Design a protein around this ligand. Structure first.
Ligand code: CO
Ligand code: CO
Lengths: 118, 118
Protein backbone atom coordinates (compact mmCIF):
# COMPACT_ATOMS: atom_id res chain seq x y z
CA UNK A 1 0.00 0.00 0.00
CA UNK A 2 3.19 2.05 0.36
CA UNK A 3 5.57 2.85 -2.48
CA UNK A 4 9.03 4.43 -2.29
CA UNK A 5 10.00 6.48 -5.33
CA UNK A 6 13.65 7.56 -5.50
CA UNK A 7 14.06 10.69 -7.57
CA UNK A 8 17.24 12.08 -9.09
CA UNK A 9 18.56 14.77 -11.43
CA UNK A 10 19.70 12.71 -14.47
CA UNK A 11 22.59 13.69 -16.79
CA UNK A 12 23.42 13.10 -20.43
CA UNK A 13 26.17 10.95 -18.91
CA UNK A 14 24.90 7.63 -17.45
CA UNK A 15 26.52 7.84 -14.01
CA UNK A 16 23.66 9.59 -12.34
CA UNK A 17 21.08 6.99 -13.50
CA UNK A 18 23.44 4.15 -12.60
CA UNK A 19 23.62 5.68 -9.09
CA UNK A 20 19.83 5.71 -8.71
CA UNK A 21 19.49 2.16 -9.94
CA UNK A 22 22.14 0.78 -7.60
CA UNK A 23 20.51 2.65 -4.73
CA UNK A 24 17.07 1.26 -5.53
CA UNK A 25 18.53 -2.26 -5.63
CA UNK A 26 20.13 -1.86 -2.22
CA UNK A 27 16.88 -0.64 -0.67
CA UNK A 28 15.17 -3.61 -2.33
CA UNK A 29 17.68 -5.89 -0.57
CA UNK A 30 16.65 -4.33 2.75
CA UNK A 31 12.99 -5.53 2.29
CA UNK A 32 11.18 -2.56 3.89
CA UNK A 33 8.94 -1.48 1.00
CA UNK A 34 6.33 -3.30 -1.12
CA UNK A 35 7.09 -1.20 -4.21
CA UNK A 36 10.31 0.67 -5.04
CA UNK A 37 10.72 2.74 -8.21
CA UNK A 38 13.20 5.33 -9.55
CA UNK A 39 12.59 8.42 -11.68
CA UNK A 40 14.92 11.01 -13.24
CA UNK A 41 13.94 14.63 -13.82
CA UNK A 42 15.76 15.43 -17.12
CA UNK A 43 17.04 13.55 -20.22
CA UNK A 44 16.54 10.03 -18.89
CA UNK A 45 14.00 7.25 -18.51
CA UNK A 46 12.12 6.33 -16.46
CA UNK A 47 10.84 9.84 -15.78
CA UNK A 48 9.36 10.97 -12.45
CA UNK A 49 5.69 10.75 -13.62
CA UNK A 50 6.41 7.39 -15.26
CA UNK A 51 7.74 6.19 -11.89
CA UNK A 52 4.77 7.52 -9.96
CA UNK A 53 2.31 5.95 -12.45
CA UNK A 54 4.25 2.66 -12.25
CA UNK A 55 3.93 2.71 -8.44
CA UNK A 56 0.18 3.41 -8.66
CA UNK A 57 -0.41 0.69 -11.31
CA UNK A 58 1.18 -1.75 -8.85
CA UNK A 59 -1.53 -0.70 -6.35
CA UNK A 60 0.25 1.70 -3.97
CA UNK A 61 -1.88 4.23 -2.10
CA UNK A 62 0.87 6.09 -0.24
CA UNK A 63 3.77 7.17 -2.46
CA UNK A 64 6.89 8.27 -0.55
CA UNK A 65 9.02 10.37 -2.92
CA UNK A 66 12.59 10.88 -1.71
CA UNK A 67 14.73 13.45 -3.57
CA UNK A 68 18.18 11.88 -3.78
CA UNK A 69 19.97 15.24 -3.79
CA UNK A 70 22.51 16.64 -1.33
CA UNK A 71 20.83 20.05 -1.01
CA UNK A 72 17.71 21.96 -1.91
CA UNK A 73 17.77 23.66 -5.28
CA UNK A 74 15.37 24.77 -8.01
CA UNK A 75 14.81 21.11 -8.80
CA UNK A 76 13.73 20.12 -5.31
CA UNK A 77 11.62 23.24 -4.60
CA UNK A 78 10.05 24.03 -8.02
CA UNK A 79 10.25 21.34 -10.70
CA UNK A 80 9.72 18.15 -8.72
CA UNK A 81 6.82 19.43 -6.54
CA UNK A 82 5.39 20.65 -9.84
CA UNK A 83 5.81 17.32 -11.68
CA UNK A 84 4.00 15.74 -8.68
CA UNK A 85 1.14 18.30 -8.82
CA UNK A 86 2.00 19.30 -5.22
CA UNK A 87 2.15 22.96 -6.24
CA UNK A 88 0.28 25.49 -8.39
CA UNK A 89 -1.88 13.10 -12.91
CA UNK A 90 -2.77 11.27 -9.58
CA UNK A 91 -6.18 10.12 -8.38
CA UNK A 92 -7.25 9.23 -4.82
CA UNK A 93 -3.77 8.52 -3.39
CA UNK A 94 -1.57 10.90 -1.36
CA UNK A 95 2.01 11.78 -2.43
CA UNK A 96 4.49 12.22 0.44
CA UNK A 97 7.38 14.45 -0.59
CA UNK A 98 10.39 13.81 1.67
CA UNK A 99 13.49 15.86 2.46
CA UNK A 100 16.91 15.75 0.70
CA UNK A 101 20.03 14.25 2.11
CA UNK A 102 21.49 17.40 3.69
CA UNK A 103 24.58 17.76 5.90
CA UNK A 104 24.04 14.45 7.62
CA UNK A 105 26.84 13.19 9.86
CA UNK A 106 26.95 10.01 7.76
CA UNK A 107 27.96 12.17 4.78
CA UNK A 108 30.90 13.61 6.69
CA UNK A 109 31.81 10.00 7.38
CA UNK A 110 31.59 9.22 3.67
CA UNK A 111 33.60 12.37 2.81
CA UNK A 112 36.43 11.37 5.18
CA UNK A 113 36.65 7.83 3.78
CA UNK A 114 36.54 9.39 0.35
CA UNK A 115 39.37 11.79 1.30
CA UNK A 116 41.61 8.84 2.22
CA UNK A 117 41.06 6.98 -1.06
CA UNK A 118 38.85 4.57 0.93
CA UNK B 1 51.13 19.90 5.22
CA UNK B 2 47.85 18.27 4.15
CA UNK B 3 44.75 20.24 3.16
CA UNK B 4 41.21 18.99 2.53
CA UNK B 5 39.25 21.01 -0.02
CA UNK B 6 35.52 20.21 -0.22
CA UNK B 7 34.13 21.05 -3.63
CA UNK B 8 30.51 21.50 -4.62
CA UNK B 9 28.24 22.64 -7.44
CA UNK B 10 26.74 25.90 -6.11
CA UNK B 11 23.30 27.24 -7.08
CA UNK B 12 21.78 30.69 -7.30
CA UNK B 13 19.86 29.46 -4.25
CA UNK B 14 21.98 29.39 -1.05
CA UNK B 15 21.20 25.85 0.11
CA UNK B 16 24.04 24.26 -1.72
CA UNK B 17 26.66 26.62 -0.19
CA UNK B 18 25.08 26.25 3.24
CA UNK B 19 25.49 22.46 2.82
CA UNK B 20 29.20 22.75 2.02
CA UNK B 21 29.85 25.10 4.91
CA UNK B 22 28.09 22.91 7.46
CA UNK B 23 29.99 19.91 6.15
CA UNK B 24 33.32 21.68 6.42
CA UNK B 25 32.52 22.64 10.01
CA UNK B 26 31.67 19.08 10.95
CA UNK B 27 34.94 17.77 9.50
CA UNK B 28 36.70 20.56 11.43
CA UNK B 29 35.05 19.19 14.60
CA UNK B 30 36.57 15.79 13.82
CA UNK B 31 40.16 17.22 14.00
CA UNK B 32 41.76 15.08 11.24
CA UNK B 33 43.04 17.81 8.90
CA UNK B 34 45.37 20.80 9.41
CA UNK B 35 43.59 22.90 6.78
CA UNK B 36 40.00 22.54 5.55
CA UNK B 37 38.51 24.77 2.84
CA UNK B 38 35.41 24.77 0.59
CA UNK B 39 34.98 25.86 -3.03
CA UNK B 40 31.95 26.06 -5.38
CA UNK B 41 32.12 25.66 -9.15
CA UNK B 42 29.81 28.54 -10.21
CA UNK B 43 27.34 31.15 -8.87
CA UNK B 44 28.99 31.62 -5.50
CA UNK B 45 32.15 32.26 -3.52
CA UNK B 46 34.61 30.99 -2.56
CA UNK B 47 35.45 29.46 -5.93
CA UNK B 48 37.49 26.28 -6.37
CA UNK B 49 40.73 28.10 -7.38
CA UNK B 50 40.22 30.56 -4.52
CA UNK B 51 39.96 27.59 -2.12
CA UNK B 52 43.04 25.87 -3.54
CA UNK B 53 45.07 29.10 -3.28
CA UNK B 54 43.78 29.63 0.28
CA UNK B 55 44.98 26.12 1.21
CA UNK B 56 48.41 26.76 -0.35
CA UNK B 57 48.79 30.19 1.32
CA UNK B 58 48.25 28.40 4.63
CA UNK B 59 51.26 26.21 3.73
CA UNK B 60 49.70 22.92 2.56
CA UNK B 61 51.77 20.72 0.24
CA UNK B 62 49.23 17.92 -0.29
CA UNK B 63 45.78 19.18 -1.27
CA UNK B 64 43.03 16.52 -1.08
CA UNK B 65 40.08 17.70 -3.20
CA UNK B 66 36.87 15.79 -2.50
CA UNK B 67 33.94 16.34 -4.92
CA UNK B 68 30.85 16.46 -2.71
CA UNK B 69 28.59 15.07 -5.43
CA UNK B 70 26.47 11.91 -5.49
CA UNK B 71 27.64 10.79 -8.95
CA UNK B 72 30.10 11.53 -11.72
CA UNK B 73 28.99 14.13 -14.24
CA UNK B 74 30.48 16.70 -16.60
CA UNK B 75 31.45 18.71 -13.53
CA UNK B 76 33.43 15.95 -11.89
CA UNK B 77 35.10 14.64 -15.08
CA UNK B 78 35.68 17.84 -17.13
CA UNK B 79 35.31 21.17 -15.32
CA UNK B 80 36.82 20.44 -11.92
CA UNK B 81 39.88 18.49 -13.19
CA UNK B 82 40.27 21.42 -15.58
CA UNK B 83 40.02 24.13 -12.90
CA UNK B 84 42.73 22.15 -11.03
CA UNK B 85 44.96 21.91 -14.16
CA UNK B 86 44.78 18.09 -13.94
CA UNK B 87 43.98 18.04 -17.69
CA UNK B 88 44.14 20.33 -20.72
CA UNK B 89 48.76 28.14 -10.23
CA UNK B 90 50.23 25.27 -8.04
CA UNK B 91 53.97 25.28 -7.37
CA UNK B 92 55.78 22.20 -5.93
CA UNK B 93 52.58 20.84 -4.44
CA UNK B 94 50.52 17.81 -5.53
CA UNK B 95 46.71 18.01 -5.90
CA UNK B 96 44.89 14.77 -5.02
CA UNK B 97 41.53 14.51 -6.73
CA UNK B 98 39.27 12.09 -4.83
CA UNK B 99 36.14 10.16 -5.78
CA UNK B 100 32.47 11.27 -5.39
CA UNK B 101 30.07 9.88 -2.88
CA UNK B 102 28.55 7.14 -5.05
CA UNK B 103 26.07 4.41 -4.06
CA UNK B 104 27.47 4.04 -0.58
CA UNK B 105 25.53 1.86 1.87
CA UNK B 106 25.44 4.82 4.29
CA UNK B 107 23.47 6.78 1.68
CA UNK B 108 20.84 4.04 1.50
CA UNK B 109 20.72 4.39 5.29
CA UNK B 110 20.19 8.14 4.93
CA UNK B 111 17.56 7.59 2.21
CA UNK B 112 15.56 5.22 4.42
CA UNK B 113 15.58 7.60 7.39
CA UNK B 114 14.65 10.33 4.96
CA UNK B 115 11.75 8.21 3.63
CA UNK B 116 10.33 7.87 7.16
CA UNK B 117 10.36 11.61 7.86
CA UNK B 118 13.37 10.91 10.13
CO1 CO C 1 19.38 20.31 -12.88
CO1 CO D 1 26.39 22.14 -12.91
Amino acid sequence: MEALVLVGHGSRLPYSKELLVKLAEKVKERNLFPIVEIGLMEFSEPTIPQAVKKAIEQGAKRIIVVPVFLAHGIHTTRDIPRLLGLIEIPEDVEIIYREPIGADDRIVDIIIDRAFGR
